[PDB]
Structure formats: C-alpha cells, structure tokens
Amino acid sequence: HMQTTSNPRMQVRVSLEKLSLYMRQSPNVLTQDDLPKPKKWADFEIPFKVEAAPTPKSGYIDALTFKFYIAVVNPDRSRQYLKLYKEVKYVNVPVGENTYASVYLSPSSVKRITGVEGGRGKWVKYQGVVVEYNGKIVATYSSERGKMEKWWTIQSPSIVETSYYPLLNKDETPFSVFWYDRYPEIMRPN
C-alpha cells in the first residue's frame, strides 16, 4: 500500500547541494573475545532539504526516491566508461531539516577501478543525483553543466551501464552499525 498517507494535494520541493566523495575506513567493531587493517570505502554524500505546500502536520513526508549515477573509467577496457546506478528510497523524510543522502562503493570496487586500496587520482569522472517524489522529478544535481548536464541519459558506445561494481546503500555496508540522525530511514527491499 504505497499511496500517500498525507494530504493528496501536497507538493514537495527539494533543495540539493553537491555529491561529494569521502574515503572512510570500515569500522573495526570491538568484541569481548578480543585486528585487521581497515580498508577504505567510497562514501558519496549529498546534502538536501525538503519543504512542502502545505506542510505535513507530522513534519515528515512518506518517502523520497534518490537515483545515483556514477561514471568511472573501465579498468579492464581503457577506452570505455562504466555507468553505475543505484536507487535509494528513503522513508519518513523530515521537512525543513538539513538532511543527507548517501551511496557507497566497496573497498574492492575502489581498488579494482583505481589499482590501489583507497583509490588515486580523480577516478570519479561523472556524477549525478536525481530526486523523485511520487514518481516526479523534483531535483537534479550533476557534475556537468549545460548540454552535458544529464549525461546519464546520453546513449553512447563509449559508456555502458553495469550491475558489477555495485553501488550500495548504507544498510548494505558496515556503516549500518552507525545510526546518525542526518540520514533518513531506508526502505527495505519489498
């Protein structure tokens, strides 16, 4: 049952900032019965904020869908770009609050792409984030401007989408152990 629980006339506006990459070490969780060298995860974060007309009495909207697009150079075929895609659906998105969305690449994805643990160079070649509310686009971020803005829509032989090098939501990473108020709850696979 995915119909709005809110005012069906409610409209939503989303302000996006930029997607930025942070290299973050995997937590070494301590245990009672007593240590590996932590590997480096790629953590892509984008600040956003939600407003609505009218404002929901609960102070939240049901859900927002984030679509992440990341392009990298194929490390096995150098004249080709790989396009990586991930949809993250958040639930109970607060209104009027500095919030963040995020997606991740594993240490082995980063090492395979770049050749070294933790990465090197500007290995992220293109970035994009599209936000949808009730199936309609309400915000777009891109690392490109003008004609190249929506690069993820460009059909070209030099860039191919792959499900390999999988993009992961926070609940698909070891950072799920760290509950932070700034990220909304992620809707589980249905």
Instruction: Find the shortest distance in angstroms from Cβ 70 to its own copies.
Output: 14
Instruction: Find the shortest distance in angstroms from Cβ 17 to its own copies.
Output: 20
Angle at 48 between CA 60 and CA 67, to 5 degrees: 95
Report the residue closest to Cl ion, judged by CB. 17
The size of the interface with Cl ion (CB under 5 A), counted in residues, is 4
Beta strands 136-142; 11-16: pairing state: unpaired
Beta bridge partners of 65: 89, 132
Angle at 104 between CA 103 and CA 108, to 5 degrees: 165
Nearest-angstrom CA–CA distance, 155 and 25: 35
User: Exactly one of 7, 20, 55, 108 binds Cl ion (CB under 5 A); which one?
Assistant: 20
Beta strands 81-94; 159-161: pairing state: parallel
The footprint of its own copies on residues 113-172 (CB under 8 A) is 113, 115, 160-166, 168, 172
Binding site for its own copies (CB under 8 A): 1-3, 5-7, 25-33, 35-39, 56-60, 62-63, 74-78, 82, 91-92, 94, 106-109, 111-113, 115, 160-166, 168, 172, 174, 176-181, 184-185, 187-190
Binding site for Cl ion (CB under 5 A): 17-18, 20-21
